[PDB]
Amino acid sequence: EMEKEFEQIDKSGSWAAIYQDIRHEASDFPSRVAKLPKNKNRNRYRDVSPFDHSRIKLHQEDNDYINASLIKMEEAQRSYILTQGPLPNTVGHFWEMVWEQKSRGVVMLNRVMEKGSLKCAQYWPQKEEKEMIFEDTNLKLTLISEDIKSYYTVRQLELENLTTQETREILHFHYTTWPDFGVPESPASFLNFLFKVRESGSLSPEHGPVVVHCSAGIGRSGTFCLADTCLLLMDKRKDPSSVDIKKVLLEMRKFRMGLIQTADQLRFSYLAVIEGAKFIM
C-alpha cells in the first residue's frame, strides 16, 4: 500500500532516487514533426516535444502541428490532451484544437505571469463585452460568466465557428494558487479543484478529451492527470491497493515526455492520491 511506501520514501528521504528511476525507465519515442524548422515558433520550449505517435493533429491542410499530446488511459477509460500554454502566435491553433477534439473543459494550472515572466498568452476574454476573434482559424470566443473563488476561477465561454455559425459552451477551470516555487503545502484545494472539474462533466466520455495545460504541459499538468487516473482506478478495481502510482506515471509517459518535472511534484502526487482515497473509501 502506497501510504506505507510514502512513509518509507519520506523517512528514508529517497524521493530524488525514486524520481531518477522513473526518469531512467521512461519511454523515448521519435518527435520528428516537432523538430521540423517550420514548427520552431510553435514550441514554447525546445526540449518539450510531443511524440509523433500521440501528437494531436490540427485539421488545417497547411501545417497540422500543435504542441499537444493525447494521453489514453485504457483501463480507467479516461483521455486527456496535455498541451503547452499557448504562444501569441498559437492562440488560434489552441482554440481550433478545442473545437476539432469536441472538448468541453480547459484546465489551466498556471498564472499568465509567474517569476516576473510570461508563462502563457492571455487566450480568453477578460470582459463580457470584449470578445476575441481568431482570424487565422475563423473562431470567435466570448466570456459568458466568471466565478472567482479563493483558490480557482471557473469561466463559462462561448466558442463560435464563424464558418458554420455553430456554438459550444466551454468551461475554463483556472487553478490560480499554485505557488511560483515548489508545490502546495496541502493537497486539499487541488483535490477540491479536481472534484469540481469532475462534477462539471468535462472528464466524461460523452465529450472529447479535456485540455490540460500549465507552461510546458508536463509538470503541474502531469500531477492533475496522474491524481485523477489513480483515484479512478481505485474506484474500479477489486483491490484498491493494487494501484501503483509509479506504474501509472510510466504508462502516461508513453504518451508525453517528462510528466512530473521534480521529486517534489512526485511526492505531492502521492499525497494527493493518498488524501483523495479517504474521500473515495
H-type helices in 117-187, by residue range?
none
All three cell numbers of 27: 519511454
- Catalytic residue of the set 120, 214, 225, 230: 214
H or E stretch covering 228:
helix 220-236
CA distance 35 to 31: 7
Active site residue 214: yes
Residue 167: other Cβ atoms inside 10 A = 11
Beta strands 113-114 and 210-213 are unpaired
Residues 192, 151 contacting (CB under 8 angstroms): yes
* HSE (side-chain half, CA atoms, 13 Å) at 125: 19
Sign of CA dihedral 169, 164, 97, 91: negative
CA distance 180 to 199: 28
Residues 119, 215 contacting (CB under 8 angstroms): yes
Q: Which residues make up each annotated binding site for substrate?
A: 180, 214-220, 261
| 181 burial via Cβ count (<10 Å: 0-12, 13-18, 19+) | exposed
Query: b/e string for 27-51 if b means 16 or more Cβ within 10 A?
Result: eeeebebbeeeeeeebbbeeebbbb
CA distance 222 to 260: 5
Rounded (10°) CA dihedral 200, 205, 209, 210: 10
Cα 41 from chain centre: 21
Residue ranges making up the domain that contains 13: 1-281
Q: Which of 247, 268, 257 is nearest to 84 (CA)?
A: 257
The resolution in angstroms reads: 1.8
Residues 55, 69 contacting (CB under 8 angstroms): yes
Strand locations in 218-276, DSSP E?
none
Residues 78, 203 contacting (CB under 8 angstroms): yes
* HSE (side-chain half, CA atoms, 13 Å) at 149: 13
Number of domains in the chain: 1
